[PDB]
Each structure stands twice: as structure tokens, then as C-alpha cells.
A paper describes a structure:
MaeK and MaeR exert their function by activating the expression of L-malate catabolic genes (maeP and maeE) and the expression of their own genes upon the presence of L-malate in the medium. Structural and phylogenetic analyses show that L. casei MaeKR proteins belong to the citrate family of TCS, as well as the characterized DcuSR and CitAB TCS. We also solved the crystal structure of the REC domain of MaeR in its activated state as well as the structure of a mutant version defective in the phosphoacceptor Asp. Altogether, our analysis has revealed that MaeKR is a non-canonical TCS conserved in Lactobacillales and that the structure of MaeR acknowledges the α4β5α5-swapped dimers as a new class of dimerization for RRs.
In an attempt to determine the MaeR unphosphorylated monomeric conformation, we performed crystallization studies of a MaeRREC mutant form where D54 was replaced by an alanine (MaeRREC-D54A). MaeRREC-D54A crystallized in the same space group and similar size dimension than the wild-type MaeRREC. The crystals were obtained at high concentrations of sulfate (1.6 M) and it is well known that sulphates can mimic phosphate ions. No interactions with the conserved Asp9 were observed due to the absence of a magnesium ion in the active site. The residues Thr82 and Tyr101 forming the Y-T switch present the inward conformation as in the MaeRREC-BeF structure, confirming an activated state for MaeRREC-D54A. The fact that the non-phosphorylatable mutant also adopts a dimeric swapped conformation indicates that this conformation is not induced upon phosphorylation. On the contrary, it supports that the swapping by itself generates the conformation competent for phosphorylation where the active site displays an organization able to accept the phosphoryl group.
Residue numbers in the entry:
A (entry chain B), B (entry chain A): 0 to 121
């Protein structure tokens, strides 16, 4: 390969885990670390990077918003998300849309009324 | 007791299931049906609706896009997403963000390289 990878992740242990794993395949030369979006933006403008490993919860901002920006400016960067956030998190915490509950299909009857009683509590 | 619901789902079977399940609790007077965003919007301007059971893959557009407009217009409405779409679908199909992969934390030793292999083939 011989390609550049930027890791953007808040927790330094998981940063080390991506670092370790990428060298355990080890096709790639330079591996950059960043704990903030502000660092990541400046690193992209500094050294040319091929792929990016991005989280959603960073210290300074939201990962999904940064990716939105990254596509608007039409960056020569291939992004792959490594994140704890599920569907419910993307809608509420990342898109700020304010959904009561995210029902996954297929669903059981008990899960449906669980999602209905969540409305009543609001 | 006594509240309004609009179902917006493109397939009429799952529409009947939502209807059947809402009555199998039954806190509600009227339950409205819709197969498009267009039919839903017109109902929202028309009759009083408290909560909305919204899908993502609708006939005339994307449910997440309809939700975004619904909040930018600031509608007095309680969305509850009932959908088969995962995180990857919200990022790429619903937000068009051209992501290579989505690893849900925590990830396996091996699933990391599969996610990298999806970069190697692009």
C-alpha cells in the first residue's frame, strides 16, 4: 500500500489500539494521531493523508459534523468510522433531531410499548 | 389518554402492524396513515398530530431528511423512528457521507482488517 492514515479519537488507549492494529496488518507507512478536530483539520492541511479513522465523540466537537465539512470541501480523504455511537446516538446526539425512540425492524410487541411509554414520560 | 398519531411508512403491511400494535395498547382516538412524505406533510398542515411514527426509506424521499425539515420548521411533533436502517444507512444512504465502513465499539481483532480491506478495494 504505502499510504497515510490519520487517527482521530479522544481516548488515548483506543488511539493506541488503532495504532497497534494498523501495524498488525502493517501495509502503511505513516500513522498520525489527533485527539481533536482542530488538530485533525490542521494535520490534513499540513501532511497529505489518504484515509482517516474517525470517532463521533471528540473533546472539541462532533465527528459527524466534521465529516460533513470534509465532504463539503471535497477532500481527497477516505473516511472509515470507528465509534461507540448507535443509530439512536446519530439522530439525537449527532444530528440533534430529538427523536423519542429508534425502533429497529424487526421488533417484538414488548419493545413497541416500551417505545410508547417513552412518549408518555415526556 | 386521547392523543393523535400519524404513521408514515411506504409498505402497507408494516403500516397495518403499527396500527394493530397501537390499538393493542389503545391510548389513542385516531391513527393516520401515510405512504409518502408528501401525504404526511399535507396531513401535518391539516389535522392535529402529537406523535409521528416515521420510517426512513419512503417512496418520495428520505425519512431523516423529512425529520430535518420538520425541526427546521419547528413543528409541535414527537417523532419516533421505526426503521430497518442501521448506522451505516444513516451515514451513507441518508446523509451521503461516502464512509468506507462503520465499526461499532467494541470491535473484534479480525473485524478491524475487514474494515481496512474495504478501503483496499477503493
Amino acid at each position: 500500500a504505502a499510504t497515510n492514515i490519520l487517527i482521530v479519537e479522544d481516548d488515548p488507549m483506543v488511539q493506541f489500539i488503532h495504532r497497534n492494529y494498523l501495524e498488525k496488518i502493517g501495509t502503511f507507512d505513516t500513522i498520525y494521531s489527533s485527539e481533536t478536530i482542530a488538530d485533525a483539520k490542521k494535520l490534513l492541511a499540513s501532511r497529505s493523508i489518504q484515509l482517516v479513522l474517525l470517532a463521533i465523540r471528540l473533546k472539541d466537537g462532533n465527528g459527524i459534523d466534521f465529516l460533513t465539512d470534509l465532504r463539503r470541501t471535497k477532500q481527497t480523504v477516505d473516511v472509515i468510522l470507528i465509534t461507540a455511537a448507535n443509530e439512536v446516538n446519530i439522530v439525537n446526539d449527532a444530528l440533534h433531531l430529538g427523536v423519542i425512540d429508534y425502533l429497529i425492524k424487526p421488533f417484538t410487541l414488548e419493545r413497541f410499548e416500551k417505545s410508547i411509554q417513552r412518549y408518555r414520560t415526556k
